Design a protein around this motif. Sequence first.
Motif: not given
Lengths: 422, 303, 54, 436
Positions: B226-239, D305-312
């Motif tokens: 879970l620590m491994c994917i944290e930066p990819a899925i965390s909602t800390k500062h998300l809307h 953007p974490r759940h997408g891809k960059y083109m530029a």
Amino acid sequence: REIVHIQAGQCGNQIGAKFWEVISDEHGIDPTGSYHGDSDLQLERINVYYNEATGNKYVPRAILVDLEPGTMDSVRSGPFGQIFRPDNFVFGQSGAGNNWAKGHYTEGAELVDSVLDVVRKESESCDCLQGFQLTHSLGGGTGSGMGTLLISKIREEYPDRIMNTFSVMPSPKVSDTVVEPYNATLSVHQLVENTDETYCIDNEALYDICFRTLKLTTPTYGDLNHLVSATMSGVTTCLRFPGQLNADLRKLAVNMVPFPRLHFFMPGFAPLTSRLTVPELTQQMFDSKNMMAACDPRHGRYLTVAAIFRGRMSMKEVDEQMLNVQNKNSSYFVEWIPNNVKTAVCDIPPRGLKMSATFIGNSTAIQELFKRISEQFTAMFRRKAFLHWYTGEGMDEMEFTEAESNMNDLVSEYQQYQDATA
Amino acid sequence: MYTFVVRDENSSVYAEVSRLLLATGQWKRLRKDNPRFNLMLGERNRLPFGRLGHEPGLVQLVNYYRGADKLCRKASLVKLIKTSPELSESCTWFPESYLAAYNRRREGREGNVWIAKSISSEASELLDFIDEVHVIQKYLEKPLLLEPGHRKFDIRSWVLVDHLYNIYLYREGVLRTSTNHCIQKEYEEGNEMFFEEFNQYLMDALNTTLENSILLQIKHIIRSCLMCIEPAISTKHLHYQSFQLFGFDFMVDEELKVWLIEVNGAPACAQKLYAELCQGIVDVAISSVFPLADPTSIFIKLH
Amino acid sequence: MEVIELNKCTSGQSFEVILKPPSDPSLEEIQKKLEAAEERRKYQEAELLKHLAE
Amino acid sequence: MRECISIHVGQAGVQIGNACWELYCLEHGIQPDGQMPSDKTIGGGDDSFNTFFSETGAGKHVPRAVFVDLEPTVIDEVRTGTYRQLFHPEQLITGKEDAANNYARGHYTIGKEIIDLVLDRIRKLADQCTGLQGFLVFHSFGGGTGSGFTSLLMERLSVDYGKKSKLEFSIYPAPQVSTAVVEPYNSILTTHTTLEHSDCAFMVDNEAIYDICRRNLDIERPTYTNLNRLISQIVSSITASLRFDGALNVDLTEFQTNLVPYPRIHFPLATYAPVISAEKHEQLSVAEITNACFEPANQMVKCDPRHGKYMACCLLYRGDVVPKDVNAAIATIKTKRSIQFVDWCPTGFKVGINYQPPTVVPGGDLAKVQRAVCMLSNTTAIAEAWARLDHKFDLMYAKRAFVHWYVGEGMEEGEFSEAREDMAALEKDYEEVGVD
Ligand SMILES: Nc1nc2c(ncn2[C@@H]2O[C@H](COP(=O)(O)OP(=O)(O)OP(=O)(O)O)[C@@H](O)[C@H]2O)c(=O)[nH]1
Ligand SMILES: Nc1ncnc2c1ncn2[C@@H]1O[C@H](COP(=O)(O)OP(=O)(O)CP(=O)(O)O)[C@@H](O)[C@H]1O
Ligand SMILES: Nc1nc2c(ncn2[C@@H]2O[C@H](COP(=O)(O)OP(=O)(O)O)[C@@H](O)[C@H]2O)c(=O)[nH]1
Ligand SMILES: [Ca+2]
Ligand SMILES: [Ca+2]
Ligand SMILES: [Ca+2]
Ligand SMILES: [Cl-]
Ligand SMILES: [Mg+2]
Ligand SMILES: [Mg+2]
Ligand SMILES: [Mg+2]
Ligand SMILES: [Mg+2]
């Protein structure tokens, strides 16, 4: 830019006269037409309702119509009576005997071109005419019959302008004659076709408010009219002062009318209380007991809603309170018109109040008011009761049948959209 | 008052959660598609995360993490472990997963059974089975067996990750015994042995305990994945904000080493625990975000 | 982390940094559109006036 | 030196336009009377700022701009405002009666009446150009003018200036400050008609700007004036490269070359930092402001953007920044953040630095900072915004709510469905380039 106001018949001229008294005050225009306010907000959009004469006089762009001189003699004598352009008083002598047919087909037919002459002259002085607002009752003869005749004729001559009415609906609780359902049903038929927006003012509702809320043992037409003119001030605030929301008649219509026939609005006012926070306004304005149409909004769904807060108050607190009522009672707003509640704020409050809120709802509950008038209409029409007053003016029964049918159709239309889901 | 919508009528767990929110008298269940909700109990697939957090004046919360599938798909998990430096090509507690290995292992007699899904010793036998995407991972072969019965099993653990990314391990787990309860149902147990009893067995038969021999490793594995994917899925500062309930599946070998099998993103629960877990969910995951008016935690916070 | 195309002016500079290699209508047709919409408005206005004349 | 012509359409376009030119003037030392002391070649020259300002023999510096609105209220303010001497009356164009938040009315009915006048005024600016690059077009998606008139204009601009670049700055509708229920209709309609004619469009979601103003400027209820001053900063950062000596994004055609590999996928996400309350500070560093470019909370459009891809991805710094510090900032970020490029593009960053710090309006809401950055990145995540909009569209359109208003103005109901289907295809396009 400019709006042209018409008032027709007794009721129409009585609320019409109060309306000008109220807004003339808010805009700092005394009964002589002279300005004496302490702000520019007052004079910034004053051209929407007033023409300008020399001596920096301001004259209402208003036309007074009646088939009988009584009420217009009373208005010319009343406080602000001297403010109206004397050339804009247009009246016959015969009267309309509370008979739609006389107002629409006979007595009224004879006077209508004189009115259109004044309507025209007023429209030609307009830089860019928005459209027209008419005040009248639907239960009598002049305002009802001639008023809707005026509307059809106005539309023929100005088909690309907005037609807006303040229509007072009849109720047995406050009734002048037994044929009011006939006159109202005939009139609604015209309104469904020829207006863009109609604020339905239910005399039943005005009475219940004067009696149950304001605790008035004997509500008078004067009391009823105080509510109406306060509401009329509130709903036109957006047209008269600086603002982004519903700033003119067409933008209001585009925001409030998802389907062309469903343009009948249930207005509301707050505060109203017998002998004041932003939350207080907000809860009251949405309160069934505050609606000027005698319908329970909890019996239907809001298609669209406009709310106007007036006075100095926290925009932040406004936004909050609105979003609460909305998100807390979200069952009563249709899901297939996203964000259908719009809010405006104006810093200038009405006379005698720190703050006030005006509510304008397009609710399917309104069908209750039409279903009520339809029931009353049908009770008599089954037995052709009192029909002779109308057949005697040239009308045929078939025309009554069509009006009934079309109003029943309107009711079915509101039910359709009350059952619609995403 | 608070509002929520229900978009997965099949979820056993959240069916019970909705039951409790309602039984709080402070939560109104809105219609499936009413967007003016505080809390979404979303559909198991194609959850529209793109439309969350854009409703003015509403704090919105959802019971799934976007991106968490990277952990909960057999094939995704393998990629993640292989190519993720803090898990690394060589990771202690995951069975090699995907030929060069088949050679080495059938170079000497020592080997060589592999299981595959989306078991055999001959490679071509199931390599043809596939074609006729899957993963092939070493079939432990040397499982730890229970007595009486001399039987294999697996351990399920329930983990709740809240909106702050606190990691909560439910103190109650279960052993599915002989492995799926669906296959098996087709010992004083019901093929479900719980911790009270399994700890006892461990003390009785092996002179050790559950915490020491197995739970430590489980905590480590959970915390690591879970620590491994944290930066990819965390909602800390998300809307909008996420929380989610996971089920981790473990195998224990005869040397008392814990092995990770998979992680489920939409786990059920032991019938007898539904009450306790589900209440915990509303306590730590929901009421933490939407507090009510006017313990002894059932969870082990992992840090 | 190759840094390429570094250009320097008195008001700053620019450059590119790389981390990993790469693993319509005519005036005519518009006028018709607008004119067709205009005719449709006119037709609707004519139907209304016809109706009002009845 | 190749000129750029700015065109401001509708209330939002005009009011944003107002704020931008105010900022430009402050940034180049142009006074409201139009004089520019620091400018030595009186009545001409080919300096960088001349791409936005022409000059008269009297030394007045005159925006190469046109303001257009179907009602005179907003433009009258320009005519009488602080910078009234900047503009020639022929640059401001107003009708009498607006589009009433109705695309069909703005496009068909009223547009038809005023298009040739607008094009004449633009031609008058073009004829004054030695080498026109193209246009920057500022408008809302939601307004009847901003949506409907803007798309008619864009079509006609393709006809009269086919070899020219066209960039958009577009205000995407947010209920928080929305003045109309039908803005989703106008948005899809205008996007459908403008798609083939725009080379690069920068969307600004009022929701995003609103929240940044509340959260970072401690403003309780942001006004259009607050919103526009922030928006103007972002625009200024984007257009700086055209108005100052530099080597990155130096002409319009380069915005496309660097940011838009696929013509239809031409909506770059903008991210800006730092936004600092003037009513308070510890100056953020290069690392920090750059790291902030990957925080959704700082984007012009709220998406992940974490759940997408960059083109530029271009980075545009203003102030005290040197390449060294940028490369170091990037390195650290690459290893702590989720940044996946499409595997058919290089994983990199085009970087532009301008030593002049952002300028702020005196007595504004923003604090002076020593360094700022605006990141333009073409990511598939921005399709989230299309999906939200298309969804609202579907809710109303399924019952035909409000459709009569558009048919009433001469538009066929069929245009609604063409437009929606084109957006469906646009969501499909994003799906492919971005999803595994
Ligand atoms: N950021 C920002 N948004 C604005 C501004 N003015 C209007 N808007 C937004 O733009 C949309 C309304 O469109 P407008 O530009 O006002 O309408 P228009 O182009 O003048 O078209 P008309 O309907 O004919 O008046 C809404 O989403 C508003 O919130 C502004 O000054 N700044
Ligand atoms: N590499 C391996 N070695 C030993 N046993 C294994 C194994 N892989 C799977 N199993 C056994 O198969 C059972 C289920 O396998 P698996 O978890 O991979 O598929 P599954 O997803 O069908 C059901 P669930 O998702 O609920 O766990 C486990 O209980 C375990 O006993
Ligand atoms: N609220 C209100 N209703 C009125 C007033 N005068 C008449 N009415 C109502 O209007 C109807 C009678 O119509 P009226 O305006 O008097 O007849 P007209 O002159 O022929 O148009 C009845 O329904 C009355 O209850 C008034 O001043 N205020
Ligand atoms: Ca006579
Ligand atoms: Ca010069
Ligand atoms: Ca082109
Ligand atoms: Cl060209
Ligand atoms: Mg009377
Ligand atoms: Mg299992
Ligand atoms: Mg699985
Ligand atoms: Mg506008």
